[PDB]
Short mmCIF file of C-alpha atoms and ligand atoms in Angstrom, two decimals:
data_model
loop_
_atom_site.label_atom_id
_atom_site.label_comp_id
_atom_site.label_asym_id
_atom_site.label_seq_id
_atom_site.Cartn_x
_atom_site.Cartn_y
_atom_site.Cartn_z
CA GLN A 1 -32.41 -25.61 41.72
CA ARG A 2 -31.23 -25.21 37.81
CA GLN A 3 -30.71 -21.96 36.41
CA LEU A 4 -29.16 -21.00 32.89
CA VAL A 5 -27.00 -18.11 32.64
CA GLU A 6 -26.01 -16.78 29.29
CA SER A 7 -22.78 -14.51 28.33
CA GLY A 8 -21.05 -13.08 25.19
CA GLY A 9 -23.53 -10.42 23.98
CA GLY A 10 -21.98 -7.24 22.66
CA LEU A 11 -21.68 -4.89 19.50
CA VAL A 12 -20.08 -6.09 16.22
CA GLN A 13 -19.55 -4.90 12.55
CA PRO A 14 -21.63 -7.02 9.75
CA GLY A 15 -19.47 -9.87 8.97
CA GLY A 16 -17.81 -10.14 12.08
CA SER A 17 -18.09 -12.97 15.08
CA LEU A 18 -19.36 -13.82 18.36
CA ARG A 19 -19.59 -16.61 20.84
CA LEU A 20 -22.66 -16.62 23.05
CA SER A 21 -22.22 -19.20 25.90
CA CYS A 22 -25.34 -20.48 28.55
CA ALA A 23 -24.04 -22.39 31.37
CA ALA A 24 -26.39 -24.34 33.69
CA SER A 25 -26.35 -24.99 37.41
CA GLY A 26 -26.76 -28.64 36.54
CA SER A 27 -25.68 -31.55 34.20
CA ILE A 28 -26.63 -30.86 30.53
CA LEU A 29 -26.80 -34.53 30.48
CA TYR A 30 -30.28 -34.46 32.27
CA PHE A 31 -31.37 -32.25 29.57
CA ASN A 32 -33.27 -33.62 26.54
CA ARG A 33 -32.97 -30.43 24.13
CA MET A 34 -31.18 -27.13 24.46
CA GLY A 35 -31.21 -24.48 22.16
CA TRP A 36 -30.79 -20.65 21.19
CA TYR A 37 -34.19 -18.28 20.72
CA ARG A 38 -33.94 -14.64 19.59
CA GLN A 39 -36.32 -11.66 20.07
CA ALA A 40 -35.69 -8.43 17.99
CA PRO A 41 -37.69 -5.19 19.40
CA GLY A 42 -41.47 -5.56 18.58
CA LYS A 43 -41.26 -9.09 17.26
CA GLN A 44 -42.35 -12.70 18.31
CA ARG A 45 -39.65 -15.43 19.53
CA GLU A 46 -37.80 -16.99 16.82
CA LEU A 47 -35.44 -20.18 17.17
CA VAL A 48 -32.27 -20.15 15.52
CA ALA A 49 -30.80 -23.24 16.82
CA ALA A 50 -31.17 -26.56 18.65
CA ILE A 51 -29.26 -29.31 20.09
CA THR A 52 -30.91 -32.77 21.30
CA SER A 53 -29.34 -35.41 23.48
CA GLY A 54 -28.91 -37.27 20.56
CA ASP A 55 -26.34 -34.85 19.27
CA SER A 56 -28.66 -33.78 16.30
CA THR A 57 -28.48 -30.00 15.56
CA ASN A 58 -31.30 -27.85 13.71
CA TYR A 59 -31.16 -24.24 12.45
CA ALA A 60 -33.55 -21.87 10.83
CA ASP A 61 -33.01 -20.88 7.41
CA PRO A 62 -31.82 -17.41 8.05
CA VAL A 63 -28.87 -18.49 10.36
CA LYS A 64 -28.27 -21.71 8.31
CA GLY A 65 -24.71 -21.98 6.71
CA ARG A 66 -23.54 -19.14 9.23
CA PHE A 67 -24.38 -20.13 12.91
CA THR A 68 -23.12 -23.40 14.76
CA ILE A 69 -24.70 -25.02 17.71
CA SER A 70 -22.08 -26.48 19.87
CA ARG A 71 -22.49 -28.11 23.51
CA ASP A 72 -19.57 -29.14 26.29
CA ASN A 73 -20.87 -31.54 28.79
CA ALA A 74 -17.93 -31.09 31.13
CA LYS A 75 -18.46 -27.23 31.41
CA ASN A 76 -22.15 -27.94 31.16
CA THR A 77 -22.44 -25.25 28.35
CA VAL A 78 -24.19 -24.90 25.25
CA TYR A 79 -22.61 -22.32 22.62
CA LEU A 80 -23.45 -20.22 19.81
CA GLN A 81 -21.04 -19.37 17.39
CA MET A 82 -22.24 -16.78 15.27
CA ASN A 83 -19.86 -16.14 11.92
CA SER A 84 -20.72 -13.67 9.08
CA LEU A 85 -23.03 -11.38 11.00
CA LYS A 86 -25.98 -9.05 9.44
CA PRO A 87 -28.23 -6.32 10.61
CA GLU A 88 -31.24 -8.74 10.30
CA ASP A 89 -29.66 -10.90 13.31
CA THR A 90 -29.84 -8.03 15.84
CA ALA A 91 -31.89 -9.19 18.89
CA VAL A 92 -31.84 -10.21 22.32
CA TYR A 93 -30.32 -14.04 22.26
CA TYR A 94 -32.08 -16.36 24.98
CA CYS A 95 -30.89 -19.88 26.23
CA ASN A 96 -33.59 -22.63 26.53
CA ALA A 97 -33.47 -26.40 28.04
CA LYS A 98 -36.14 -28.91 28.16
CA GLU A 99 -36.08 -31.82 30.84
CA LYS A 100 -38.17 -34.68 30.90
CA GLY A 101 -39.17 -35.55 34.42
CA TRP A 102 -39.09 -39.26 36.12
CA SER A 103 -42.56 -39.29 35.22
CA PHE A 104 -44.37 -38.38 31.96
CA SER A 105 -44.51 -34.65 31.96
CA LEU A 106 -41.54 -32.06 31.11
CA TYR A 107 -39.80 -28.83 32.44
CA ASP A 108 -38.91 -25.74 30.19
CA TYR A 109 -35.98 -23.73 31.45
CA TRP A 110 -34.87 -19.94 30.21
CA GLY A 111 -32.06 -17.81 30.79
CA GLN A 112 -31.92 -14.07 31.59
CA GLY A 113 -31.08 -13.08 27.67
CA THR A 114 -27.97 -11.59 26.10
CA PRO A 115 -28.31 -8.60 23.75
CA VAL A 116 -26.37 -9.01 20.48
CA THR A 117 -26.15 -5.56 18.22
CA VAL A 118 -25.03 -5.78 14.65
CA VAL A 119 -24.35 -2.16 13.71
CA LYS A 120 -23.00 -0.50 10.58
CA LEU A 121 -22.93 3.14 9.70
CA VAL A 122 -23.46 3.49 6.22
CA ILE A 123 -22.63 7.02 4.47
CA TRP A 124 -23.99 8.13 1.06
CA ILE A 125 -21.82 10.91 -0.65
CA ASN A 126 -20.80 11.77 -4.17
CA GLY A 127 -17.83 10.54 -6.06
CA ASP A 128 -16.41 13.71 -6.84
CA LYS A 129 -16.35 14.45 -3.01
CA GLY A 130 -13.49 13.35 -0.46
CA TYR A 131 -15.07 10.01 0.37
CA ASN A 132 -11.61 8.57 1.34
CA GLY A 133 -10.82 11.51 3.86
CA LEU A 134 -14.50 11.16 5.29
CA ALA A 135 -13.50 7.33 5.79
CA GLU A 136 -10.51 8.49 7.75
CA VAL A 137 -12.93 10.42 10.10
CA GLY A 138 -15.01 7.12 10.18
CA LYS A 139 -11.85 5.05 11.12
CA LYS A 140 -11.42 7.57 14.00
CA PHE A 141 -15.03 7.02 15.20
CA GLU A 142 -14.53 3.19 15.34
CA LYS A 143 -11.41 3.48 17.64
CA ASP A 144 -13.33 5.61 19.78
CA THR A 145 -16.91 3.52 19.87
CA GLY A 146 -16.67 0.23 17.93
CA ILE A 147 -19.00 1.06 15.12
CA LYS A 148 -18.10 0.61 11.35
CA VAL A 149 -17.81 3.42 9.27
CA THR A 150 -18.40 2.28 5.66
CA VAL A 151 -18.61 5.33 2.93
CA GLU A 152 -20.35 4.67 -0.29
CA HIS A 153 -20.45 6.48 -3.62
CA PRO A 154 -23.17 4.87 -5.90
CA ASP A 155 -24.29 6.48 -9.29
CA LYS A 156 -27.46 8.92 -9.28
CA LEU A 157 -27.47 8.86 -5.53
CA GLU A 158 -29.61 12.30 -5.77
CA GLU A 159 -32.71 10.26 -7.34
CA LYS A 160 -31.74 6.82 -6.04
CA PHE A 161 -31.76 8.03 -2.39
CA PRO A 162 -35.68 8.87 -2.22
CA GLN A 163 -36.56 5.63 -4.18
CA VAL A 164 -34.22 3.29 -1.68
CA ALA A 165 -35.02 5.12 1.55
CA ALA A 166 -38.41 5.26 1.31
CA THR A 167 -38.92 1.57 0.54
CA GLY A 168 -36.05 -0.20 1.68
CA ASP A 169 -32.85 0.88 3.97
CA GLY A 170 -30.58 2.84 2.12
CA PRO A 171 -28.11 4.70 4.13
CA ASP A 172 -27.86 6.45 7.59
CA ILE A 173 -26.95 9.71 6.62
CA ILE A 174 -27.02 11.26 3.06
CA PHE A 175 -24.72 14.23 1.46
CA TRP A 176 -25.68 16.04 -1.09
CA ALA A 177 -26.35 19.92 -1.88
CA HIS A 178 -29.16 21.58 0.21
CA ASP A 179 -31.34 22.15 -2.89
CA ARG A 180 -32.30 18.45 -2.81
CA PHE A 181 -33.46 18.33 0.72
CA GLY A 182 -36.77 20.19 0.50
CA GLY A 183 -38.19 17.53 -1.63
CA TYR A 184 -36.75 14.98 0.91
CA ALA A 185 -38.21 16.94 3.60
CA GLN A 186 -41.79 17.22 2.20
CA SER A 187 -42.04 13.38 1.38
CA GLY A 188 -40.92 12.50 5.00
CA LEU A 189 -37.57 10.76 4.10
CA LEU A 190 -35.56 12.72 6.38
CA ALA A 191 -35.32 13.09 10.19
CA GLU A 192 -35.59 16.58 12.31
CA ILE A 193 -32.18 17.81 13.25
CA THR A 194 -31.96 18.72 17.32
CA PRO A 195 -28.46 20.11 17.75
CA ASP A 196 -27.66 21.92 21.11
CA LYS A 197 -26.77 25.57 21.27
CA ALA A 198 -22.86 24.86 22.04
CA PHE A 199 -22.97 22.84 18.62
CA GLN A 200 -25.16 25.16 16.89
CA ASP A 201 -22.83 28.23 17.48
CA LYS A 202 -19.86 26.61 16.26
CA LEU A 203 -21.17 26.78 12.35
CA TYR A 204 -22.03 30.47 10.77
CA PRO A 205 -25.82 31.46 11.53
CA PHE A 206 -26.50 31.92 7.53
CA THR A 207 -25.46 28.33 6.81
CA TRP A 208 -28.01 26.97 8.83
CA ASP A 209 -30.63 28.87 6.91
CA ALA A 210 -29.83 26.72 4.19
CA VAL A 211 -30.46 23.38 5.84
CA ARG A 212 -34.24 24.76 7.07
CA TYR A 213 -37.62 23.76 5.63
CA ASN A 214 -40.80 24.91 7.03
CA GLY A 215 -39.20 26.10 10.47
CA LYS A 216 -37.29 22.54 10.97
CA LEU A 217 -33.52 21.91 10.70
CA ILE A 218 -33.47 18.84 8.02
CA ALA A 219 -29.51 18.68 7.85
CA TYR A 220 -25.96 19.76 9.34
CA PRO A 221 -24.39 22.42 6.94
CA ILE A 222 -20.77 21.44 5.77
CA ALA A 223 -19.48 23.86 3.24
CA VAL A 224 -20.25 26.50 0.55
CA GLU A 225 -19.85 25.47 -3.13
CA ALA A 226 -19.53 27.43 -6.12
CA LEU A 227 -18.05 26.95 -9.56
CA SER A 228 -15.32 29.02 -10.66
CA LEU A 229 -13.11 29.59 -13.84
CA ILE A 230 -10.25 27.01 -13.62
CA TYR A 231 -7.56 27.92 -16.23
CA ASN A 232 -3.77 26.67 -17.13
CA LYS A 233 -1.53 29.63 -16.17
CA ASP A 234 1.20 28.36 -18.88
CA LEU A 235 -1.23 27.98 -22.00
CA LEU A 236 -2.99 31.24 -20.82
CA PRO A 237 -1.50 33.85 -18.38
CA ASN A 238 -4.24 36.54 -18.80
CA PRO A 239 -7.47 34.70 -18.95
CA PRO A 240 -10.81 35.89 -20.52
CA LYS A 241 -12.72 38.37 -18.41
CA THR A 242 -15.78 38.09 -20.79
CA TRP A 243 -17.69 34.89 -22.33
CA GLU A 244 -17.78 36.71 -25.80
CA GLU A 245 -13.95 36.91 -26.22
CA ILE A 246 -13.56 33.10 -26.19
CA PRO A 247 -14.34 32.48 -29.82
CA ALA A 248 -11.19 34.50 -30.66
CA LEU A 249 -8.97 32.97 -28.04
CA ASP A 250 -10.52 29.12 -29.18
CA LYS A 251 -9.24 30.34 -33.03
CA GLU A 252 -5.84 30.79 -31.58
CA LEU A 253 -5.54 27.92 -29.35
CA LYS A 254 -6.85 25.70 -32.04
CA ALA A 255 -4.06 26.75 -34.48
CA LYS A 256 -1.69 25.29 -31.92
CA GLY A 257 -3.45 21.66 -31.32
CA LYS A 258 -5.44 23.07 -28.13
CA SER A 259 -9.28 24.02 -26.90
CA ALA A 260 -9.84 27.00 -25.24
CA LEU A 261 -12.71 25.90 -22.78
CA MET A 262 -14.11 22.41 -21.87
CA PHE A 263 -16.65 21.87 -19.19
CA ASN A 264 -19.41 19.45 -18.45
CA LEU A 265 -22.40 20.40 -20.75
CA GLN A 266 -24.73 17.29 -19.78
CA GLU A 267 -25.32 18.70 -16.13
CA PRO A 268 -27.37 22.00 -16.12
CA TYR A 269 -25.62 23.41 -12.77
CA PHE A 270 -22.35 24.03 -15.23
CA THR A 271 -24.18 25.71 -17.76
CA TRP A 272 -26.66 27.83 -15.77
CA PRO A 273 -24.18 30.63 -14.59
CA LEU A 274 -23.83 31.69 -18.45
CA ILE A 275 -27.90 31.18 -18.92
CA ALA A 276 -28.64 33.40 -15.99
CA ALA A 277 -25.81 35.87 -16.56
CA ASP A 278 -28.48 38.62 -17.60
CA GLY A 279 -31.62 37.02 -16.36
CA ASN A 280 -37.12 35.60 -20.35
CA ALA A 281 -34.69 37.78 -22.56
CA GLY A 282 -31.70 36.78 -20.36
CA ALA A 283 -32.18 32.91 -20.92
CA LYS A 284 -32.73 33.36 -24.49
CA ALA A 285 -29.43 35.50 -24.52
CA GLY A 286 -27.10 33.24 -22.69
CA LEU A 287 -28.29 29.82 -24.04
CA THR A 288 -27.97 31.19 -27.92
CA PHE A 289 -24.40 31.92 -26.96
CA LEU A 290 -23.90 28.30 -25.75
CA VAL A 291 -25.72 27.01 -28.61
CA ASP A 292 -22.98 29.02 -31.15
CA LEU A 293 -20.23 27.62 -29.40
CA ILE A 294 -21.30 24.06 -30.37
CA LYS A 295 -22.37 25.25 -33.97
CA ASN A 296 -18.92 27.22 -34.28
CA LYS A 297 -17.33 23.75 -33.52
CA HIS A 298 -15.42 25.16 -30.54
CA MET A 299 -16.95 23.07 -27.95
CA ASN A 300 -18.01 19.34 -28.38
CA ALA A 301 -21.66 17.98 -28.34
CA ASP A 302 -21.37 15.51 -25.70
CA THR A 303 -18.82 17.29 -23.29
CA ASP A 304 -19.12 15.41 -19.91
CA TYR A 305 -17.48 15.51 -16.36
CA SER A 306 -14.64 13.09 -17.35
CA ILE A 307 -13.61 14.33 -20.70
CA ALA A 308 -13.52 17.69 -19.45
CA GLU A 309 -11.39 17.19 -16.59
CA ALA A 310 -9.05 14.82 -17.89
CA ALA A 311 -8.43 17.14 -21.05
CA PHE A 312 -7.74 20.13 -18.56
CA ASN A 313 -5.40 17.94 -16.68
CA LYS A 314 -3.73 16.32 -19.51
CA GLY A 315 -2.93 19.74 -20.73
CA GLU A 316 -5.30 19.77 -23.77
CA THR A 317 -7.49 22.74 -22.84
CA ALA A 318 -6.58 26.10 -21.61
CA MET A 319 -9.57 26.44 -19.27
CA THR A 320 -12.56 24.70 -17.35
CA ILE A 321 -15.32 25.41 -15.12
CA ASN A 322 -15.57 23.29 -11.71
CA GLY A 323 -15.65 23.34 -8.03
CA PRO A 324 -13.55 23.03 -5.03
CA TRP A 325 -13.43 19.23 -5.36
CA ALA A 326 -11.78 19.30 -8.64
CA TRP A 327 -8.66 20.98 -7.42
CA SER A 328 -6.57 17.98 -5.87
CA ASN A 329 -6.94 16.05 -9.28
CA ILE A 330 -5.28 18.98 -10.81
CA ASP A 331 -2.55 18.92 -8.32
CA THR A 332 -2.05 15.70 -8.68
CA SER A 333 -1.36 16.43 -12.45
CA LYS A 334 1.65 18.87 -13.57
CA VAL A 335 -0.42 21.77 -14.58
CA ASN A 336 -0.02 25.16 -13.03
CA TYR A 337 -3.43 26.15 -12.50
CA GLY A 338 -5.51 28.96 -11.43
CA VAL A 339 -8.87 29.50 -10.14
CA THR A 340 -10.78 32.95 -10.83
CA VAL A 341 -13.96 34.71 -11.66
CA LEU A 342 -16.10 33.06 -14.10
CA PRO A 343 -16.57 35.24 -17.37
CA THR A 344 -18.97 38.13 -17.68
CA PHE A 345 -21.68 37.73 -20.29
CA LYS A 346 -23.27 40.85 -22.01
CA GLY A 347 -21.37 43.12 -19.45
CA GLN A 348 -23.11 41.46 -16.58
CA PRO A 349 -21.60 38.57 -14.55
CA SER A 350 -22.30 34.85 -14.87
CA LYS A 351 -24.56 34.19 -11.79
CA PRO A 352 -23.54 30.42 -10.64
CA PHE A 353 -26.11 28.68 -8.21
CA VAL A 354 -24.63 28.07 -4.63
CA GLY A 355 -24.93 25.01 -2.99
CA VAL A 356 -24.30 24.13 0.66
CA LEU A 357 -22.84 20.66 1.08
CA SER A 358 -25.36 19.26 3.82
CA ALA A 359 -25.49 16.01 5.81
CA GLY A 360 -29.19 14.63 6.63
CA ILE A 361 -30.08 11.48 8.69
CA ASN A 362 -32.44 9.05 6.82
CA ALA A 363 -35.98 8.79 8.65
CA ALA A 364 -35.73 4.92 8.47
CA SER A 365 -32.63 4.70 10.18
CA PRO A 366 -32.26 2.87 13.43
CA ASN A 367 -28.91 4.79 14.19
CA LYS A 368 -30.04 8.35 14.56
CA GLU A 369 -28.24 8.85 17.77
CA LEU A 370 -24.82 7.30 16.57
CA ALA A 371 -24.92 9.34 13.21
CA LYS A 372 -25.79 12.45 15.38
CA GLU A 373 -22.59 11.58 17.31
CA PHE A 374 -20.49 10.94 14.15
CA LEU A 375 -21.72 14.28 12.53
CA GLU A 376 -21.23 16.65 15.86
CA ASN A 377 -18.12 15.44 17.53
CA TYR A 378 -16.32 13.68 14.74
CA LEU A 379 -16.81 15.26 11.34
CA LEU A 380 -18.04 18.96 12.19
CA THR A 381 -14.77 19.67 13.77
CA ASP A 382 -11.65 21.15 12.75
CA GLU A 383 -9.80 17.86 13.01
CA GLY A 384 -12.90 16.33 11.02
CA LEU A 385 -13.19 18.83 8.12
CA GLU A 386 -9.27 19.03 7.32
CA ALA A 387 -9.48 15.03 6.86
CA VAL A 388 -11.85 15.52 4.13
CA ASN A 389 -10.53 18.88 2.39
CA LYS A 390 -7.05 17.05 2.23
CA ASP A 391 -8.57 14.43 0.10
CA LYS A 392 -10.97 16.78 -2.17
CA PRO A 393 -11.55 20.42 -1.14
CA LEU A 394 -15.05 21.03 0.37
CA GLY A 395 -14.73 24.50 -0.58
CA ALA A 396 -15.83 27.51 1.91
CA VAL A 397 -16.47 25.23 4.96
CA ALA A 398 -19.54 26.12 7.56
CA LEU A 399 -17.20 26.00 10.70
CA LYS A 400 -16.32 29.38 12.16
CA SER A 401 -12.99 28.11 13.23
CA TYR A 402 -11.82 27.74 9.60
CA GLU A 403 -11.96 31.36 8.60
CA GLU A 404 -8.22 32.06 8.88
CA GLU A 405 -7.35 29.06 6.91
CA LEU A 406 -10.04 29.56 4.09
CA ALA A 407 -9.16 33.38 3.73
CA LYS A 408 -5.47 32.14 3.32
CA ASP A 409 -6.18 30.41 0.17
CA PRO A 410 -6.38 32.12 -3.18
CA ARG A 411 -9.00 29.75 -4.75
CA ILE A 412 -11.21 30.06 -1.99
CA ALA A 413 -11.14 33.96 -2.58
CA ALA A 414 -12.26 33.03 -6.34
CA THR A 415 -14.70 30.76 -5.16
CA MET A 416 -16.31 33.35 -2.92
CA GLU A 417 -16.28 35.84 -5.52
CA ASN A 418 -18.58 33.55 -7.58
CA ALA A 419 -20.69 32.99 -4.75
CA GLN A 420 -21.42 36.63 -4.21
CA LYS A 421 -22.25 37.25 -7.72
CA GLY A 422 -24.40 33.76 -8.01
CA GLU A 423 -27.36 33.23 -5.27
CA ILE A 424 -28.35 30.29 -2.95
CA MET A 425 -30.72 27.79 -4.34
CA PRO A 426 -34.13 27.54 -2.74
CA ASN A 427 -34.42 23.98 -1.06
CA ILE A 428 -38.08 23.75 -2.13
CA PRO A 429 -39.67 20.64 -3.50
CA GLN A 430 -40.15 21.75 -6.97
CA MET A 431 -36.51 21.82 -7.57
CA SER A 432 -35.76 18.50 -8.70
CA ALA A 433 -38.65 19.26 -11.69
CA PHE A 434 -36.89 22.21 -12.40
CA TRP A 435 -33.58 20.79 -12.67
CA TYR A 436 -35.07 17.82 -15.04
CA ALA A 437 -36.60 20.59 -16.89
CA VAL A 438 -33.39 22.64 -17.47
CA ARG A 439 -31.17 19.32 -18.27
CA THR A 440 -33.38 18.45 -21.03
CA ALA A 441 -33.51 22.00 -22.44
CA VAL A 442 -29.68 22.37 -22.57
CA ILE A 443 -29.07 18.95 -23.73
CA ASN A 444 -31.84 19.37 -26.78
CA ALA A 445 -30.46 22.62 -27.85
CA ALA A 446 -26.78 21.15 -27.68
CA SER A 447 -27.45 18.33 -30.02
CA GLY A 448 -29.70 20.18 -32.16
CA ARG A 449 -33.35 19.07 -31.59
CA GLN A 450 -35.61 21.86 -30.10
CA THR A 451 -34.98 25.61 -31.04
CA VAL A 452 -33.55 28.13 -28.02
CA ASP A 453 -37.19 30.02 -28.09
CA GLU A 454 -38.98 26.69 -28.05
CA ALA A 455 -36.50 25.24 -24.80
CA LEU A 456 -37.81 28.03 -22.55
CA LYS A 457 -41.44 27.28 -23.44
CA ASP A 458 -41.39 23.64 -22.43
CA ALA A 459 -39.27 24.50 -19.55
CA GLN A 460 -41.52 27.04 -18.13
CA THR A 461 -44.53 24.75 -18.00
O1 LIG B 1 -26.66 19.58 -12.61
C1 LIG B 1 -27.89 19.65 -11.87
C2 LIG B 1 -27.30 19.50 -10.24
O2 LIG B 1 -26.57 20.16 -9.98
C3 LIG B 1 -26.34 20.40 -8.62
O3 LIG B 1 -25.71 19.25 -8.02
C4 LIG B 1 -24.32 19.56 -8.26
C5 LIG B 1 -23.91 19.29 -6.86
O4 LIG B 1 -24.39 20.23 -5.86
C6 LIG B 1 -22.30 19.35 -6.84
O5 LIG B 1 -21.73 19.41 -5.54
C7 LIG B 1 -21.55 18.85 -7.84
O6 LIG B 1 -21.31 17.60 -7.48
O7 LIG B 1 -22.24 18.61 -9.21
C8 LIG B 1 -23.46 18.42 -9.08
C9 LIG B 1 -23.89 18.80 -10.56
O8 LIG B 1 -23.10 17.92 -11.33
C10 LIG B 1 -27.46 20.50 -7.74
O9 LIG B 1 -27.16 20.30 -6.17
C11 LIG B 1 -28.65 19.14 -8.14
O10 LIG B 1 -29.61 19.27 -7.43
C12 LIG B 1 -28.71 18.96 -9.41
O11 LIG B 1 -29.26 18.10 -9.87
#
């Protein structure tokens, strides 16, 4: 009898290629039509290509331009050269042949089927982090498996993820501080994390608590993040221990063509430590001080991450407020820097919010088990976290094995100092609305629109 046998089905990276081949146990000359049909999980049959005895080749609009149906009557084989592959292609590919009998009737013949998988691992992480290093981990993953690991860093990913991931595809794995994850969890945008005891035991038990919402693990903890006072040791050997002595220092420095302190005033995460130093009466005190700095022309009105960073690295400002991630760019520059305790306000310390960098799996992802493999066996390893850390520092890693190395770093000590003086952010769904309320409040008071008393009024609502 006549039997069709397909081959060439495997795993590939989008943009890659695959040659399917279907050999018959009889001459293709006898066939009228030969063609390729595909079936994806839970879907109807979809013709992709066909070739008639008359040498005419037809294709479906999705594959048109990308796929070519070929035939070799010597080898008694029909081919499908699939170039520039996409995730929509992923399906079981079947070979079909039709034969007119001697009489009026016809015969349809089918094959076993050959599986084609187009898989890409996509990761969303912020641009201020070590995406290049994260890619080096991803490159080792592809060597040991065959899956592509692209690393993306889009602007406003914290508020682009819940919109895109809900409707569209978005990323497989999302990287952000733990505070944003409760809102994703409530909305149903994250898969439940199920790590075995042995993996679970590799990380500090306090770190796991930050990535828990209603008794379910919603992410993998990576590292603890806290803002510290970054200062130029040459321009300022004995930096301010108090916030209230910065105006004096600024007067001194402005005479020599230099600023005292430049940091990101737009993002409320940077201004919150000063605001929360005393506490309400504490928020009113802390903000009024911040307002007086801009009013006394000590700080610029629209001071953002880039002009603050650049100014410090250039050697224009004596101080800056930033996280572990910012250190590598300073090292690149020729600035003898120091990381220390944040200045105190009204005697009491400035309480910076503490973030736990965490990796979560998108609920609407087909690569949930592949991402778990990447996160556990490749990223959350000594070797894996090292790679990320040499690009842009992670801070105090969640890995137990890294304690000695963390403790040997003076900047980590300063980070932990500030983290103890601060507090971990609750993961709750209301954090988004909270942060927005503070973002507006600080900008309005900074520019000169709303009063300090009226800012806390609108923010408490
Ligand atoms: O600015 C408010 C913003 O702050 C925090 O985001 C931090 C993030 O945690 C850090 O890793 C760093 O990259 O900067 C961000 C602020 O610029 C909160 O995690 C976030 O929810 C909040 O929107």
